């Protein structure tokens, strides 16, 4: 397989496409199987992206659309988009030559647009080809394999399992030794905020060398120096493929790694269609589990709810007691920012409901999953789907996350009676003295 980014350029599209690898057999201990599966998830992801771009060009002689799409098709002769894409400056795409051959192309980009070659007939791009991160990660990871086998680290792995608002990032910031350790986190904005918080005094201790995103670490590995970090701290580590974590522990050359997360919140979601990510693969294999049971964010009534989901006596430092309420609504058609202003951060459980509210004129709406890890003073939670919604259950991680974002209040607006209404109704009746007992 290709092990150099440059090699992806002009590679035949078919060479990167693989038949639904839903029939992959893995060998070796769990960590090795997880690492192999992670690489395969990337191969599958890239395969689907390339395959769809080829299909766009090959399924029909031509394709022209009037409405903007997630994909785009460029007519080379005129340099006009026959199918207009929602994104710009895509890192790569699939090229159709006049001889009707299909190759992947790392697109250069400025003139009046994409730089094309003489034998190019059409260029297809999509939201999946905006960046070539999968390609960069694959080339990095493949170089770490010896005959398809990865090396598992002997480092001790400690899971710091904490409740919502226990202050996981604050702990990392207090525990880390910036001169010897490395901190990794998924988002770019997330990494930047870790550095800003660390450097609040004005003294720079956190740099782009010791606090980075997971993608950056993987994509540029060995580009310069190969540093041996004493300890590795992975914020939001449970939101990554377990195979990815195993690789990070190994690649950092650490003696110990601390993975920060909450096993009751929303874990990594396998978004690769037709690709298996079994339950035994989904469980991160760690050596020790540290627990944090005090929330520095949630009111006492929410803490009462949390206490039913975690053993170990969940406590809160906040003086807020009651904070939840709920009411029925007929549907999106009956509400709008004017007639029904919604206080604070507006959240929905699904993308569909989110779109429905945005369509009503509400601004800055996000799904519960999208705001995992975030804190708000007031929350307006909305359920517009009347039919069954799996993720809305008494013991659902989504429900737990939806109730633990606020510090002041939360109001649930729903079109139908459901488990969350029951939860809120019960919390409203919990003994005031019982709520007093959670404060620490």
Swiss-Prot record:
Result of altering residue 308 to N/R: Overcome partially tomato Tm-1-mediated resistance (AC A7M6E7) thus leading to increased infectivity in resistant tomato plants
Domain (+)RNA virus helicase ATP-binding: 130-292
Effect on the protein upon substituting residue 308 to D/K: Overcome tomato Tm-1-mediated resistance (AC A7M6E7) thus leading to increased infectivity in resistant tomato plants
Binding site for ATP: 165-170, 197, 296-297, 405, 426-429
SS bonds (residue pairs): none
Stretches the record annotates as Helicase: 159-414
Domain spans labelled (+)RNA virus helicase C-terminal: 293-440
Stated role: Is a methyltransferase active in RNA capping and an RNA helicase. Methyltransferase displays a cytoplasmic capping enzyme activity. This function is necessary since all viral RNAs are synthesized in the cytoplasm, and host capping enzymes are restricted to the nucleus. Helicase region probably exhibits NTPase and RNA unwinding activities (Potential). It also acts as a suppressor of RNA-mediated gene silencing, also known as post-transcriptional gene silencing (PTGS), a mechanism of plant viral defense that limits the accumulation of viral RNAs.
Name of the featured protein: Replicase small subunit
Protein source organism: Tomato mosaic virus (strain L) (ToMV)
Residues included from the entire protein: 672 to 1111 of 1616
């Amino acid at each position: 397989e290709i092990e150099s980014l440059e090699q992806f350029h002009m590679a035949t599209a078919s060479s990167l496409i693989h038949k639904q690898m839903c029939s992959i057999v893995y060998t070796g201990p769990l960590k090795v199987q997880q690492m192999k599966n992670f690489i395969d998830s990337l191969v599958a992801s890239l395969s689907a992206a390339v395959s769809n771009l080829v299909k766009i060009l090959k399924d029909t002689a031509a394709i022209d659309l009037e409405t903007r799409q997630k994909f785009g098709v460029l007519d080379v002769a005129s340099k006009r988009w026959l199918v207009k894409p929602s994104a710009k400056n895509h890192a790569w795409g699939v090229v159709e030559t006049h001889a009707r051959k299909y190759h992947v192309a790392l697109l250069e980009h400025d003139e009046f647009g994409i730089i094309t070659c003489d034998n190019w007939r059409r260029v297809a791009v999509s939201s999946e080809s905006v960046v070539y991160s999968d390609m960069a990660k694959l080339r990095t990871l493949r170089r770490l394999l010896k005959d398809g086998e990865p090396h598992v680290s002997s480092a001790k792995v400690v899971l710091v399992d904490g409740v919502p608002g226990c202050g996981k990032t604050k702990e990392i910031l207090s525990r880390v030794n910036f001169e010897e350790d490395l901190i990794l986190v998924p988002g770019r904005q997330a990494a930047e905020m870790i550095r800003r918080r660390a450097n609040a005094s004005g003294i720079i201790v956190a740099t782009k060398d010791n606090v980075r995103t997971v993608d950056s670490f993987l994509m540029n590995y060995g580009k310069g120096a190969r540093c041996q970090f004493k300890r590795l701290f992975i914020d939001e580590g449970l939101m990554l493929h377990t195979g990815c974590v195993n690789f990070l522990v190994e690649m950092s050359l650490c003696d110990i790694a601390y993975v920060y997360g909450d096993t009751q919140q929303i874990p990594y979601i396998n978004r690769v269609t037709g690709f298996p990510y079994p339950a035994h693969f989904a469980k991160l294999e760690v050596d020790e589990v540290e627990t944090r049971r005090t929330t520095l964010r949630c009111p006492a009534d929410v803490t009462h709810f949390l206490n039913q989901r975690y053993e170990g006596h969940v406590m809160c430092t906040s003086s807020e007691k009651k904070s939840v309420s709920q009411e029925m609504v007929s549907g999106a058609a009956s509400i709008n920012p004017v007639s029904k202003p919604l206080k604070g951060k507006i959240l929905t459980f699904t993308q569909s409901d989110k779109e429905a509210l945005l369509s009503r004129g509400y601004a800055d709406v996000h799904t519960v999953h999208e705001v995992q890890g975030e804190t708000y003073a007031d929350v307006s939670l909305v359920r517009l789907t009347p039919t069954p919604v799996s993720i809305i259950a008494r013991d659902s991680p989504h429900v737990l996350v939806s109730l633990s974002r606020h510090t002041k209040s939360l109001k649930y607006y729903t079109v139908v009676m459901d488990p969350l209404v029951s939860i809120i109704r019960d919390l409203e009746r919990v003994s005031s003295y019982l709520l007093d007992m959670y404060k620490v």
